[PDB]
Every structure is written in C-alpha cells, then in structure tokens.
Amino acid sequence: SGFRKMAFPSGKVEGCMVQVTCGTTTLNGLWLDDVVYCPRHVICTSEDMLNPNYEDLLIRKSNHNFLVQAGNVQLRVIGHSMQNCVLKLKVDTANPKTPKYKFVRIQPGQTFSVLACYNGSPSGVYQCAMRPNFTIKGSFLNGSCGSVGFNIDYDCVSFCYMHHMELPTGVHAGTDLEGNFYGPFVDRQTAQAAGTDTTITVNVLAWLYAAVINGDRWFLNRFTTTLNDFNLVAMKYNYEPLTQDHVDILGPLSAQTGIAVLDMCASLKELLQNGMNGRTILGSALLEDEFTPFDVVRQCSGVTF
Amino acid sequence: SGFRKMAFPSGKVEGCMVQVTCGTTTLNGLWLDDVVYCPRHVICTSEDMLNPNYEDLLIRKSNHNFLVQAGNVQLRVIGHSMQNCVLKLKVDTANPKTPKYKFVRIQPGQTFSVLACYNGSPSGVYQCAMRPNFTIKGSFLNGSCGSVGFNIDYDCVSFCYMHHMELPTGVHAGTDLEGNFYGPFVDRQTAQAAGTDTTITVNVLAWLYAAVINGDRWFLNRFTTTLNDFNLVAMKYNYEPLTQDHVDILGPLSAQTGIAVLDMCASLKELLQNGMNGRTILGSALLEDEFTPFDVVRQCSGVTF
Ligand SMILES: *CC(=O)Nc1ccc(N(C(=O)c2ccco2)[C@@H](C(=O)NCc2ccccc2)c2cccnc2)cc1
Numbered sequence: 066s067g068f069r070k071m072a073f074p075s076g077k078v079e080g081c082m083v084q085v086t087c088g089t090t091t092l093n094g095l096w097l098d099d100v101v102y103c104p105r106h107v108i109c110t111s112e113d114m115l116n117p118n119y120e121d122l123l124i125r126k127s128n129h130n131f132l133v134q135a136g137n138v139q140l141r142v143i144g145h146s147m148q149n150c151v152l153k154l155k156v157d158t159a160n161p162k163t164p165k166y167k168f169v170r171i172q173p174g175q176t177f178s179v180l181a182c183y184n185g186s187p188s189g190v191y192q193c194a195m196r197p198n199f200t201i202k203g204s205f206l207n208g209s210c211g212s213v214g215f216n217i218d219y220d221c222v223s224f225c226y227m228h229h230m231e232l233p234t235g236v237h238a239g240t241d242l243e244g245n246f247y248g249p250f251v252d253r254q255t256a257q258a259a260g261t262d263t264t265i266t267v268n269v270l271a272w273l274y275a276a277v278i279n280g281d282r283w284f285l286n287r288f289t290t291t292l293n294d295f296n297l298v299a300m301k302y303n304y305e306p307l308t309q310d311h312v313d314i315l316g317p318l319s320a321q322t323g324i325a326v327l328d329m330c331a332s333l334k335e336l337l338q339n340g341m342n343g344r345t346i347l348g349s350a351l352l353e354d355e356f357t358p359f360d361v362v363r364q365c366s367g368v369t370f
Numbered sequence: 371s372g373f374r375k376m377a378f379p380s381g382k383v384e385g386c387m388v389q390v391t392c393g394t395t396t397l398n399g400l401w402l403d404d405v406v407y408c409p410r411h412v413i414c415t416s417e418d419m420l421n422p423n424y425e426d427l428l429i430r431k432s433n434h435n436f437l438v439q440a441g442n443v444q445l446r447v448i449g450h451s452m453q454n455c456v457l458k459l460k461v462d463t464a465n466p467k468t469p470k471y472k473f474v475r476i477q478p479g480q481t482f483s484v485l486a487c488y489n490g491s492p493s494g495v496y497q498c499a500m501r502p503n504f505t506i507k508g509s510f511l512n513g514s515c516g517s518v519g520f521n522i523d524y525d526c527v528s529f530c531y532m533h534h535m536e537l538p539t540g541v542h543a544g545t546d547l548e549g550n551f552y553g554p555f556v557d558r559q560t561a562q563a564a565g566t567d568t569t570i571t572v573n574v575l576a577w578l579y580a581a582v583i584n585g586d587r588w589f590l591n592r593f594t595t596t597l598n599d600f601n602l603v604a605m606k607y608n609y610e611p612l613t614q615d616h617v618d619i620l621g622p623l624s625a626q627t628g629i630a631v632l633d634m635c636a637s638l639k640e641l642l643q644n645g646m647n648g649r650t651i652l653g654s655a656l657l658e659d660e661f662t663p664f665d666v667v668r669q670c671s672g673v674t675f
C-alpha cells in the first residue's frame with residue numbers, strides 16, 4: 066500500500082511556535098504553559114557568535130528587552146533564566162493551545178519530525194534521524210533556529226530537538242529541550258568536527274522488512290548468517306554493530322513477514338557486497354536508514370493520534 | 371543548508387478532518403464551513419464495490435443515516451447531495467476551525483501534501499506529486515479514503531486531492547474536491563490500467579538546480595544542447611517533453627545559479643546516458659522528480675505561511 070517518509074501531523078506544535086526578538090536578533094521559540102523556550106544565542110550579535118560569553122551577555126538583558134510574539138498576540142516577559150544552551154522566558158499568559166507534552170532526550174538512530182519555522186511562522190515539516198554522530202541532515206536556513214523536533218504518542222507531544230547551528234559541513238546540530246547539545250557541539254561560530262558517521266543498521270533492516278511487506282522482495286536470498294559474521298561485514302561497510310537488543314526490537318516485523326532477522330541480515334550482507342544491480346527498493350537506489358522498526362510498524366498498521 | 375522532501379504544516383487541515391459513517395463503512399471527511407465532503411463509496415458495502423449503482427444506493431439513504439463525528443463533536447446532517455464521485459453532507463454547524471480555502475484541480479507534475487487519516491484522526495503527512503498518468507504513489511491503508519491533498523499559500527489552503535482507491539498495482543487514485551477523478555479511473559473494484567507513466571522533466575531539472583545551490587555540483591559539465599536535441603533524449607528515457615513554458619518557469623533558478631537551462635539539460639542528458647557512477651545528488655542515487663521549481667524556490671528562500 067505504499068511506503069513514504071512520513072512526518073507527524075504538525076498542528077499541536079504549530080500552536081506553540083512564537084517569535085523571539087532580543088534587541089536585533091529574531092529566532093523561533095516554543096511556548097508551553099507560561100514559559101517560552103528558545104536558543105540562548107538570541108542574545109548575540111554577529112560578532113558575539115565568534116566567542117560569546119553567554120553569562121556576561123545575558124547579564125545586560127532585562128525581562129523587558131525580550132519581545133515575544135505569538136502571531137499577533139503579545140506575551141509579556143516576567144522572568145528569564147538560562148538553562149544550559151536554552152533561554153527560558155516566563156510570560157504572563159499560559160499558552161491556551163499547549164498540548165500534552167514531555168521533554169525527551171533521544172538516542173542516536175531514533176527519528177523525529179521537524180517543524181521548520183522562520184520568524185515564528187511554520188514553513189514545512191519533514192522526518193529525519195539523529196545520526197550516530199549526533200548531527201542531523203536537516204533543511205534549515207538562517208532564521209530557522211529555535212525550530213523543534215518532536216514525536217507524537219497518541220495525545221502527547223514529546224519534544225526532543227531544538228535547532229541551534231549549521232556546521233561548516235552543511236549538517237545541523239542542536240539541543241534537547243533542557244538545552245544540552247547532542248554530541249560534542251557548542252553554540253559558537255568555530256569549526257567543529259562531527260566525527261565519523263555510520264549507517265543505522267537496525268533501521269536499514271526495518272526498512273527491508275517494510276519493503277517485503279509492500280511487495281519488493283527481489284533481494285531475499287536464502288543464505289543466513291550469524292550475528293558475529295554479519296557484524297564483520299557491518300564494520301567493513303561502516304554500519305553500526307547489530308546487537309541482540311536490535312534483533313529483539315525487530316521481532317514483530319520478523320513475526321509478520323515470517324523472515325528471521327538473521328536471514329534478513331544475510332540479504333543485507335549481499336546487498337552491501339554486491340549493490341542493487343540498478344534495481345530499487347521502495348523507490349530508492351540506496352539503503353535507507355531513517356525508518357525505525359517503530360516507524361515501519363506505525364506506517365504499516367495505520368496508527369493514528 | 372540541506373534539502374528535504376518537505377510537506378506543508380498540517381494544522382489548518384487537521385482541524386477540518388472528520389469521521390463519516392454510513393451504516394457500516396467508516397471513511398474520512400473534510401469539514402469546511404457547514405459542509406462535509408467525503409468519498410461517495412462511504413455508502414457501499416464490500417459487495418457493492420464490485421459494480422455499484424451509486425444513484426440507487428444513495429436513494430436508500432436519508433440525512434439521519436449519516437453519522438459525522440469531529441473528534442467528540444457531533445454534526446447533525448441536514449442535507450446530502452452527490453457531486454460526481456463525492457458526497458456532500460450539509461451539517462447544522464459551521465466548522466469553527468475552517469481556514470481560508472479554495473478548491474483547485476491541479477495539473478500532472480504538480481506536488482502537494484497528503485494528510486493521511488484513519489477514522490477521522492490524522493496519522494502523518496508527506497509530500498508527493500500527481501504523476502503524468504494521474505496516479506499518486508502514496509502511503510494509504512484501508513480506512514484512509516477521504517484523506518486529502520493540499521497546498522498552502524500564505525493563509526489559504528488549496529485542496530486539490532481526495533483519496534478514493536488503491537489500484538491492484540499498489541498505486542493510488544482519487545478526485546478533486548468537486549468529485550472528478552484524476553485520470554481515467556472510476557470508483558469501482560475492477561482492474562484499471564493507469565497507463566504509461568513518465569518522469570517529470572521540469573521537476574528533475576529544478577532538483578538539479580537545488581543540488582547546485584546546496585553544493586552538489588559534480589554533474590555539471592560544459593556541454594550545452596538544444597531543446598529539440600534534448601527532447602530526443604527525453605523521449606528515449608521516458609521523460610516528459612520539455613517546452614519553452616518549462617524553460618521559462620525555471621528562469622528564476624537559472625538566474626540564481628547562473629546556469630542556463632539548456633546547460634542544465636546537457637548535464638541531465640549525460641546523467642541519463644551514463645548514470646551517476648555510484649555517486650549521489652542531494653542524498654539520492656536516482657533522479658528525483660517530485661520537486662517543482664516552486665518547491666525549490668520555497669525551500670531555498672524560507673517562505674513561511
Ligand atoms: C539557526 C539560525 O537561525 N541561525 C541564524 C543565522 C543568522 C542570523 N542573523 C540574521 O540576521 C538573520 C535572521 C534571519 C535571517 O538572517 C544574524 C544577525 O541578526 N546579524 C548578523 C550580522 C552580520 C553582519 C552584519 C551585521 C549583522 C545573527 C544574529 C545572532 C547570531 N548569529 C547570527 C540569525 C540566526
């Protein structure tokens with residue numbers, strides 16, 4: 066029935082997006098209850114970003130120096146606090162459109178939807194993965210900072226990402242909603258190594274299961290392999306090592322398709338050693354790793370929220 | 371700054387999604403002002419779908435046989451009318467969350483966002499193209515019928531698609547919001563030929579321009595070609611013929627990159643004749659055709675709504 070890179074419905078997050086202006090810089094903020102969250106470098110000028118002393122820069126700021134606009138609504142700032150790399154602005158009004166929510170720090174390999182915003186207004190939504198090296202391959206222009214990443218569980222929005230920087234390599238870095246960067250990155254305009262990225266093996270396997278479910282099965286052989294022998298191949302091709310924890314979370318997909326995980330591993334080994342011979346899998350000519358086993362189950366079961 | 375298949379924010383559409391039940395079948399409907407729109411086969415049983423007489427089947431239905439639920443809200447149906455392949459249910463309450471909207475019949479090659487829904491509840495959002503053969507390659511399970519496709523212009527939602535059927539080939543067909551199918555399809559469970567699909571040449575070219583803008587430029591040669599000579603190649607590789615209308619709409623991208631459209635055509639010719647040599651373009655190993663020139667401009671300019 067088709068398989069697409071699918072983002073969560075963005076409505077509940079759209080109603081939380083605000084514009085935050087501090088003197089001259091304007092970023093996006095996230096308005097939940099009576100608190101607005103945004104990147105702390107909203108307080109920086111251009112020159113500041115080269116080597117900012119955030120504690121000293123914020124000391125020059127008072128509540129009234131922060132202007133927060135929810136579309137046309139004014140939020141009056143009545144308190145401010147720096148938490149790690151995020152600034153929290155207490156406002157005098159609770160957001161009436163605040164959804165049920167939690168703040169979550171995700172693991173590499175997990176996926177989420179990004180609501181790209183500019184000047185507090187939503188521009189688009191897309192699905193992506195936290196890379197093993199804690200970067201994301203987003204689509205973010207100047208002014209997108211403060212855009213957030215999230216997952217939705219039924220009624221509950223779980224915020225996991227706030228956007229903070231573009232590395233000189235064109236990939237993206239940011240924090241959880243407590244302001245702690247993913248990976249080694251700092252909010253400073255200095256060159257920063259992201260480190261060797263790898264392909265998310267358990268996600269590739271999940272996507273191969275999605276392919277079989279949807280009719281694409283040309284890559285099924287009937288070799289099998291062992292975990293240790295497969296991991297030798299995974300290492301050669303810069304794939305993350307597969308663990309019994311990964312095999313276990315693939316269990317439901319293995320059960321639906323009747324294809325043992327180690328059998329799918331042997332198919333993946335042959336795809337890695339021989340490529341795709343100019344064929345495609347679910348409309349792709351590469352091995353796709355930004356679908357989790359949960360993502361496949363959700364899209365293949367029709368789970369709503 | 372990265373390039374992603376990006377859907378519109380789905381909030382304005384989420385607030386229009388309702389569940390429509392007629393005796394036993396439950397589909398999605400679209401609630402705008404005091405009218406709910408949904409597929410007319412909401413009135414069919416399983417056996418009906420093989421060869422339905424929709425006029426006779428609807429004659430057995432009264433206003434009170436239709437149950438419409440907006441989350442937990444009841445809409446009282448006070449009128450009903452069949453328009454082509456859609457059923458319109460007049461309800462006694464205007465949707466308070468009705469956005470500014472228009473109904474639009476799109477052209478093949480144009481793109482839109484789909485809000486996949488089940489039982490009136492949104493499941494996910496993704497971007498896709500109306501194929502040249504008037505199918506779409508969606509992700510739709512049983513119960514997704516009535517999900518809609520749309521574009522957003524600033525404040526105005528333009529609805530262009532309502533989902534009606536899955537062809538035995540696994541691709542998808544549906545109507546505009548006046549109930550007229552795209553392509554030759556009928557809402558009947560019979561085998562139906564979709565016809566030769568082709569690749570949307572102007573969109574591939576737009577995406578090549580996006581690649582250059584974002585740093586991927588290995589495919590630039592300095593051959594050029596002519597429209598007629600390129601179209602000979604386009605025909606060989608089942609690409610849509612390129613017209614001066616297409617060249618014109620690529621003008622802004624040509625102006626930004628300083629790369630003449632016929633020069634990009636020569637690059638596309640070499641990519642078609644020689645493939646990608648195991649390299650990638652914007653993270654893909656295939657020539658991507660579901661970005662319009664407008665889509666590239668929007669994502670590359672940071673246009674909000
Ligand atoms: C993630 C993100 O949003 N990054 C970002 C980059 C650049 C800016 N700045 C903008 O002006 C801007 C806002 C929207 C589009 O562009 C600058 C800024 O405000 N002044 C920079 C400058 C440069 C040269 C001469 C004068 C001024 C900015 C502000 C603060 C920190 N970095 C960059 C915002 C956000």
Ligand SMILES: *CC(=O)Nc1ccc(N(C(=O)c2ccco2)[C@@H](C(=O)NCc2ccccc2)c2cccnc2)cc1
Binds near residue numbers: 394397510513514516
């Ligand atoms: C696009 C779309 O939504 N198509 C669709 C397929 C199948 C159904 N039906 C369902 O039951 C259903 C709803 C959600 C998931 O599945 C059937 C139906 O209601 N009864 C079919 C049936 C088959 C065998 C024995 C008894 C009954 C359906 C209803 C009307 C028309 N076609 C199919 C809904 C929608």
